[PDB]
Amino acid sequence: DYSVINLRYGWVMDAAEVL
Amino acid sequence: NNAMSRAGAQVIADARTNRLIILGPPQARAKLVQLAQSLDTP
């Protein structure tokens, strides 16, 4: 299913290659 | 463009007048207008 979340200090730039 | 898996629906940008023309299912329309309303937040 589809969702959108925030990040406080996390970077989606680093987490993109992760996820 | 990658909202639909590997196409079906389509999406067209307007970077001068910031418009979005989407050609697809109504739930992707609704959920991504909600992501737009969360997306145009600073």
Class of B1-41 in CATH: alpha beta
Give how far A6 is from chain B: nearest CA, Å. Answer: 10
Q: Report whether B9 contacts B25 (CB < 8 A).
A: yes
Q: What is the structure's resolution, reported in angstroms to one decimal? A: 3.6
- For residue B27, the chain A residues in CB contact (below 8 A) are none
Region of residue A2 (phi > 0: left; psi between -120 and 50: alpha; otherwise: beta): beta
* Strand, coil or helix: B10: strand
What token pair was written down for A7?
């990040």
Q: Which chain A residue lies closest to B37 (C-alpha atoms)?
A: A4
Place of tokens 């996390």: A10
What token pair was written down for B25?
């299912």
What token pair was written down for B37?
């309303």
H-type helices in chain B, by residue range?
26-39
Q: Report whether B3 contacts B28 (CB < 8 A).
A: yes
Sign of the Cα pseudo-torsion (B14, A17, B37, B29, in order) = positive
What token pair was written down for A4?
């959108």
- CA B23, CA B11: separation in Å to the nearest integer? 6
Method: cryo-EM
Q: Is A2 on the interface with B (CB under 8 A)?
A: yes
- CA B2, CA B13: separation in Å to the nearest integer? 14
